[PDB]
């Protein structure tokens, strides 16, 4: 009972209405005022609703809040791709010690989008990195959907497992995903082989690009 919870995950398409509930008990939502917060990736939380129902200045009428029993609901109408964010409820709890609660948060995913195949772009080690006796090959993976790829590297057709690091995909500002993968090598490994390849697998389809020092 000194706890707020929310569904971890909600999803809908552009133009739809979606709701997110926050469930508590008599000592918190039952007695106290609920506020809601939006949080974009990287960013500080932003106040969306306060005092159960009120919007601050600057928040659009598409967002509304209500309360009933020991639950509270945020509603978003005319869903936009920009509304993709984490959402949190908060209220004071009057019990015990205790003070301010937040719900565990809800990731709202906006599901407009069609399948798109990744583009793969490779950069060889720079001249400055090689002068510093290192070499990093960079594979940039872009404009894909959905947001799940696997990346493998090859030297001349044989797999290279050691020295690979790949980011978890994140949204580009056009709403498709991008990711990156790095292969660390010695300068002499880089200068020797005929070639190195980044192979990106997405929804059962593999695309690869290939490069070599001679180029």
């Amino acid at each position: 009972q000194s706890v707020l919870t929310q569904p971890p995950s909600v999803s809908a398409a552009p133009g739809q209405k979606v709701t997110i509930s926050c469930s508590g008990s008599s000592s918190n939502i039952g007695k106290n005022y609920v506020s809601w917060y939006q949080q974009l990736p990287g960013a500080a939380p932003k106040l969306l609703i306060f005092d159960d129902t009120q919007r601050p200045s600057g928040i659009p009428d598409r967002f509304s809040g209500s309360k009933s029993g020991t639950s509270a609901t945020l509603a978003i109408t005319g869903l936009q791709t920009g509304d993709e964010a984490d959402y949190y409820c908060g209220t004071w709890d009057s019990s015990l010690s205790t003070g301010q609660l937040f719900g565990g948060g809800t990731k709202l995913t906006v599901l407009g989008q069609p399948k798109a195949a990744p583009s793969v772009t490779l950069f060889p080690p720079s001249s400055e990195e090689l002068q510093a006796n290192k070499a990093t090959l960079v594979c940039l993976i872009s404009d894909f959907y959905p947001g799940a790829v696997t990346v493998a590297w090859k030297a001349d057709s044989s797999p290279v497992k050691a020295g690979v690091e790949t980011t978890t995909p994140s949204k580009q500002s056009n709403n498709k995903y991008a990711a990156s993968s790095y292969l660390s090598l010695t300068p002499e490994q880089w200068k020797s082989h005929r070639s190195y390849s980044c192979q990106v697998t997405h929804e059962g389809s593999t695309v690869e690009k290939t490069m070599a020092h001679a180029e």
Binding site: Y37, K46, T121
Partner: protein, 225 residues
């Protein structure tokens, strides 16, 4: 014109303490105004402490009780949070927040309307290390259809975070700055890429501005074809 500005990212060793500041303008701190909230990577918001309706004094969440201190300095309009006996699980972004002028006098209630930008505190025994910055040069590999991709590789730093801008902030369109990877060496690395008109390449200078404040590192790399 309400702004809230926190101190920079910090790394601290297990068992040590950290002290975050929070400077507020456009509103006068009362001494009772500031709440602190943290967020561990990929987890939800967790209130740490602040002033509540009933009890007329600063209140701390039971997880932090024996080891946190929250002060508020009215002559300096600055607020401070000190957390000691730090552990791994104290790696988090720490936020201060306030109601500002969102105080309702018919019920006493305020929401948290104004938040700082966050201060990342990393709890680790690894040493602070500034990045090397390398250009990712545009080529015909990175060129299709009148546009070309170029970038900067920001390699081998600790702790998070770094910032990258392009052309001192004049270039924002077409920019994508990736999340860092944490490498098996225990150092981070990331890249930032921008797509530009391939017609510009001859003539327009492209410079990535990289800052890593925990190591006082500032590098501006010109990226050429």
């Amino acid at each position: 014109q309400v702004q809230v500005v926190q101190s920079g990212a910090e790394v601290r060793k297990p068992g040590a303490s950290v002290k975050v500041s929070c400077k507020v303008s456009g509103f006068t701190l009362t001494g009772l105004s500031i709440h602190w909230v943290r967020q561990a990577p990929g987890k939800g918001l967790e209130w740490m402490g602040g002033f509540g309706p009933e009890e007329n004094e600063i209140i701390y969440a039971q997880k932090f009780q024996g080891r946190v201190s929250m002060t508020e300095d009215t002559s300096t309009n600055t607020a401070y949070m000190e957390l000691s006996s730090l552990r791994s699980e104290d790696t988090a972004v720490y936020y201060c927040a306030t109601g500002g002028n969102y105080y309702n006098l018919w019920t006493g209630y305020y929401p948290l309307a104004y938040w700082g930008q966050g201060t990342l505190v990393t709890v680790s025994s690894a040493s602070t290390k500034g990045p090397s910055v390398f250009p990712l040069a545009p080529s015909s590999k990175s060129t299709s259809g009148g546009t070309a991709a170029l970038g900067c590789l920001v390699k081998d730093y600790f702790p998070e975070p770094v910032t990258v801008s392009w052309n001192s902030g004049a270039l924002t369109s077409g920019v994508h700055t990736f999340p860092a990877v944490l490498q098996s060496s225990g150092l981070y690395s990331l890249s930032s890429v921008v797509t530009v008109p391939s017609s510009s390449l001859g003539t327009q200078t492209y410079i990535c501005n990289v800052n890593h404040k925990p190591s006082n590192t500032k590098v501006d790399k010109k990226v050429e074809p």
